[PDB]
Amino acid sequence: MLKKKQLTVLDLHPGAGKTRRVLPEIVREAIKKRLRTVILAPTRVVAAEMEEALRGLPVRYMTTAVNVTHSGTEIVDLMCHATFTSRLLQPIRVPNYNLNIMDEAHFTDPSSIAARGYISTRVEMGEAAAIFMTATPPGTRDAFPDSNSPIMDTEVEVPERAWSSGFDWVTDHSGKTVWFVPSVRNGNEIAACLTKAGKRVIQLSRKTFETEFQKTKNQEWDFVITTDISEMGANFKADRVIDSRRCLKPVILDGERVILAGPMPVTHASAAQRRGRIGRNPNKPGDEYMYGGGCAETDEGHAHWLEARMLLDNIYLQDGLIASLYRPEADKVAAIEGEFKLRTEQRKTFVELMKRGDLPVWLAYQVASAGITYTDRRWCFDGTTNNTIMEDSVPAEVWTKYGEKRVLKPRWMDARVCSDHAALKSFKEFAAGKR
Ligand SMILES: Fc1ccccc1CNc1cn[nH]c1
């Protein structure tokens, strides 16, 4: 695996021991060969599990998710996918890693896709080696891969709203269920219906994942209601998955706005990862996977792959050269390499809008490419009437930094800034000049 110009896809089935068995063996061999190595975890939760699995090896944990004193001598760095891409974008020195290991390498967040593009380009140039660890590599067509124990697969109508009758199988279960929903708002409604029926429900999504995931360990629960974030190495002691087989797809319409299309079918890779939360214990056969629709390759035209090009266009590789997307996922976007390359000052603005601003890549790009400075929030108020953001069916309102009450009406409308109450609260604070 460790020879220059090699990219290895470590595609053992879910729970085959890629993280707990194979990764420490790879790391021991890398230190032996004096290979400067990076290990990319999808989430802080996974970074912490890796620290436990690599305990006793010289690894620098570039995450506050791990409280450990470093020797100062480590040639192996461990950080989140997003942290890798973030450091490449910033005027911060990132070493030339000889070996690039990405765990949960199916992750379709823009920063993960960009990290794969950068790494796979370095390998294709003959500059480095890489290992992508995932049961479900890009373009996989198998929603039903092997497992540690036999799984009971059942195609069944799954509720996507509160229900009063007709789904007794859902609540009649006495074990623990992980239930994949397409959105936070859809999970809230299902969670409330289960709570009313006497169930203990934990809800997970991207913004709450680190905090809430700990509850699955510290308290008893009947259901976990989760978005697609639990596809990225989240482990549960569960015996059933309920899978809507539905997701939302961000779509850029007419180059001018982002909508959240769907819900629509998940990819085969997503379905396999959702299913792969169970069947993990060889001593407990007959875990259940109930699934409520088909799969389709909905990553085609999905805004994350265009956002990944925006990130890679703004990352230095070699003189004018720009990293390509990893070949198997490179057709998911119709884009010109370099089309999103910003001049130094607009790139700095782009970075700050993502990092401090917490804006979606697409929206950060529109603002930075328009020549707007990070603190200039006039654009949050001067859009067309149909860009009005609504809150409880009235136009949303904030007090500007000038102390004026104004309707939130952004010049560029990205549905992700108001997809739930927490998102819209964050965007209101942004529009108000509070960060
Ligand atoms: F009530 C005010 C007086 C002066 C400036 C602003 C406000 C409103 N609150 C706010 C919005 N952004 N930052 C602060």
Residue 321: which of 117, 132, 94, 101 has the closest Cα? 117
Residue 356: which of 380, 373, 369, 339 has the closest Cα? 373
Q: Do domains 7-133 and 152-291 have the same CATH topology?
A: yes
Q: Is 16 annotated as a binding residue?
A: yes
Residues in the chain: 435
User: What is the CB neighbour count within 10 angstroms for residue 23?
Assistant: 21
Residue 222: which of 281, 162, 179, 286 has the closest Cα? 179
The domain 7-133 belongs to what CATH superfamily? P-loop containing nucleotide triphosphate hydrolases (3.40.50.300)
Distance (Å, whole) CA 289 – CA 280: 12
In angstroms, what is the C-alpha Rg of the chain? 22
Distance (Å, whole) CA 104 – CA 349: 30
Phi first, then psi, for residue 151 (nearest 5°) are -110, 140
Ligand 1 touching residue 401 (CB < 6 A): yes
Distance (Å, whole) CA 269 – CA 132: 15
Distance (Å, whole) CA 185 – CA 415: 13
The domain 152-291 belongs to what CATH superfamily? P-loop containing nucleotide triphosphate hydrolases (3.40.50.300)
Query: What atom in ligand 1 is closest to the CA of residue 401?
Result: 12
Ligand 1 touching residue 435 (CB < 6 A): no
255 exposed, middle or buried (CB, 10 Å; 0-12, 13-18, 19+)?
Answer: exposed
Ligand 1 touching residue 185 (CB < 6 A): no
Tokens for 396, please give them. Answer: 């949303």
Give 399 Cα–ligand 1 centroid separation in angstroms: 6
* Structure-determination technique: X-ray
Q: Is 19 annotated as a binding residue?
A: yes
Residue 82: which of 199, 210, 176 has the closest Cα? 210
Beta bridge partners of 291: 155, 243
What does the CA dihedral 292, 294, 296, 301 come to, rounded to 10 degrees? -40
Nearest residue by C-alpha to atom 3 in ligand 1: 403
CB-facing half-sphere around the CA of 87: CA atoms within 13 A? 17
Resolution reached, in Å? 1.7
Q: Is 14 annotated as a binding residue?
A: yes
Ligand 1 touching residue 197 (CB < 6 A): no
Ligand 1 touching residue 432 (CB < 6 A): yes
Rounded to a whole number of angstroms, the distance between the first and last alpha carbons of the chain is 45
Give 361 Cα–ligand 1 centroid separation in angstroms: 27
Sign for the CA dihedral angle at 84, 89, 93, 98 comes to positive
Distance (Å, whole) CA 376 – CA 366: 13
Beta bridge partners of 321: 318
Tokens for 58, please give them. Answer: 């010289």
Question: CB–CB of 281/153 below 8 Å?
Answer: no
Distance (Å, whole) CA 204 – CA 377: 31
Query: What atom in ligand 1 is closest to the CA of residue 433?
Result: 12
**Torsion-angle region of 161 (φ positive above 0: left; ψ -120 to 50: alpha; else: beta):** beta
Map the chain to HEC letters: CCCCCCEEEECCCCCCCHHHHHHHHHHHHHHHCCCCEEEEECCHHHHHHHHHHCCCCCEEECCCCCCCCCCCCCCEEEEEHHHHHHHHHCCCCCCCCCEEEEECCCCCCHHHHHHHHHHHHHHHCCCCEEEEECCCCCCCCCCCCCCCCCEEEEECCCCCCCCCCCCHHHHHCCCCEEEECCCHHHHHHHHHHHHHCCCCEEEECCCCHHHHHCHHHHCCCCEEEECHHHHCCCCCCCCEEEECCEEEEEEEECCCEEEEEEEEECCHHHHHHHHCCCCCCCCCCCEEEEECCCCCCCCCCCHHHHHHHHHHCCCCCECCECCCCCHHHHHHCCCCCCCCCCCHHHHHHHHHHHHCCCCCHHHHHHHHHCCCCCCCCHHHCCCCHHHCCEECCEECEEECCCCCEEECCCCCEEHHHHCCHHHHHHHHHHHCCCC
Q: Probe ligand 1: pick from 376, 399, 408, max atoms within 8 Å of CB?
A: 399
317 exposed, middle or buried (CB, 10 Å; 0-12, 13-18, 19+)?
Answer: middle
Amino acid identity for residue 12 in this structure:
L
Beta bridge partners of 257: 253, 413
Distance (Å, whole) CA 1 – CA 130: 8
Residue 217 makes CB contacts below 8 A (sequence gap 6+) with none
Question: CB–CB of 50/78 below 8 Å?
Answer: yes
Distance (Å, whole) CA 282 – CA 81: 31
Distance (Å, whole) CA 191 – CA 215: 15
Amino acid identity for residue 113 in this structure:
I
Map 163-199 to HEC letters: CCCCCHHHHHCCCCEEEECCCHHHHHHHHHHHHHCCC
Distance (Å, whole) CA 84 – CA 76: 14
